């Protein structure tokens, strides 16, 4: 209710809004690379599964 208090509130809000958030692009790239890894491993397993019914890999 005092013009000093509101100015201090504005200053503290400006201080708090400048917090450095963590990097997110690399964080998501981690998940993307893990997805690629899992896909490759599952593809290897599926290919070796196919090599059981017949005696040759695809093509």
């Amino acid at each position: 209710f005092t013009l000093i208090e509101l100015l201090i509130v504005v200053a503290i809000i400006g201080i708090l809004a400048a917090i450095a958030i963590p990097q997110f692009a690399a964080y998501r790239q981690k998940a993307f690379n893990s997805a690629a890894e899992s896909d490759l491993k599952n593809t290897k397993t599926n290919l070796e599964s196919y090599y059981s019914e017949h005696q040759f890999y695809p093509n």
């Binding site: 809004a17 400048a18 917090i19 958030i21």
Partner: peptide, 13 residues
């Protein structure tokens, strides 16, 4: 009197 800006790859305003 200010023009704040940021971007996806950045980490602060």
């Amino acid at each position: 009197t200010r023009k704040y800006a940021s971007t996806s790859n950045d980490t602060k305003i």
